[PDB]
Symmetry: none
Subunit: 138 residues, 4 copies
């Protein structure tokens, strides 16, 4: 383990706004929030360049009674058995379901999976969260 | 004063990767990059959400052997039994875990809960996704 | 009359495996084996559970492309929004899915919900696990 | 596809009790219930003999604040990354958690995983459900 200490210069008003927000959010200090910003930045780069394994989640909301969205979702998901780990489903109301799919594999592959799922007519709301397996982060 | 200079300590491995990336992009120094990361952060955390009823997910990744993140995560979640429906956990490797927490409630409170979870010491990365179970 | 004779139709693949197994065990005929399966079934479905508050899981496996099991499962679950907390789904292969439904409520109603789910046409196999969140 | 029709003789009172129960449970008919009994019987055999892949779930309940059960559970689970697919956790009350772990792999391996998890002091209630991947059933 090795910690490297270095200095940086940030516009004073920008920094003031930052400190105000991170406190409200719940961060204990500025260094923790900035390290998080850097981890986030590195993860985004991981999804842009390379073939390294990444992980993500795809959250969707739909009316299971409308059209063939239910059958369409299953067929798409079963087409990617290697990338999709599992999914959590919550019955919102009589007709609406919330589903979150956990995926792990190559970035391009996962982005295509999200494109297919989210572009479904029956999917009303949806979002892909790009994160990490944590292996390459500390 | 226009600029405020201060120090920060970061594990070398993490700083190495950060330096490589910003060099490629064409950044002249670390302060420029971090300045941009901070501005984007503020912008994303300033958008208003309202207070309607929403359903969402909070995705997080962490090393379960780091500090007391595991205990902190559980205690924090058990305080909001009403908003937290369930959580899905995937063991990534010997140390890393990915967790997805499904929530439902007033947008204000949900945002607040997500903020606390994501800012917990030990959480490496995470994102909140809030949606209105209504029409597209 | 002591014995009642009747017929049943079964996919050949399934019957082949069943025959192999009962032959090994030393069963003299299919009626002996099925008789035992029926008796055990009755015994397991006669134990009383009460009506206290319980939390449980219903594990099921099915071919999502078979009949209307997928629609039936969803409709049935959406009728009990109060007892069903969430469900975890794992895609086993091109056709088979494993699902685990977490439930909470009065033992009587939970048992009834589990019975309906497990007896739905299309469900290949499944089990209910009911527990009292209390002390061991 | 080939359906084989055959006859069987069951003690009359046993059959009467069976028909009564399956109706109450929700089965449409006696043939469906019996085919389910046969599938269940074949799955049990799959967990006894062979090395064929099986699937199961381990449901447990514990007080996350008591002793080191939380840390113990994670360490055990992370020791079997290949067999454990994912887990669903529900916060029962201020202190009690319900967790269900989905596993897939070899029977002996999974039974040992359940032995370790269920034998934990902090685990108050628990049960392994032995089922199938569905691949070998119809
Ligand atoms: Cl300062
Ligand atoms: Cl008859
Ligand atoms: Ni299909
Ligand atoms: Ni639903
Ligand atoms: Ni606690
Ligand atoms: Ni884990
Ligand atoms: Ni419906
Ligand atoms: Ni599936
Ligand atoms: Ni550990
Ligand atoms: Ni809990």
């Amino acid at each position: 383990m090795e910690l490297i200490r270095f200095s940086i210069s940030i516009p004073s008003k920008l920094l003031e706004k930052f400190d105000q927000i991170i406190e409200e959010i719940g961060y204990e200090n500025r260094s923790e929030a900035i390290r998080d910003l850097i981890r986030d930045f590195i993860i985004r780069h991981e999804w842009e360049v390379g073939n390294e394994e990444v992980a993500g989640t795809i959250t969707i909301v739909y009316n299971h009674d409308e059209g063939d969205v239910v059958k369409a979702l299953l067929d798409l998901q079963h087409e990617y058995l290697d990338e999709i780990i599992s999914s959590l489903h919550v019955h919102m109301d009589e007709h609406n379901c919330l589903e979150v799919i956990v995926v792990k594999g190559e970035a391009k592959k996962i982005k295509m999976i999200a494109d297919k799922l989210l572009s479904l007519k029956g999917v009303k709301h949806g979002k892909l969260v790009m994160t990490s397996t944590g292996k390459e982060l500390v």
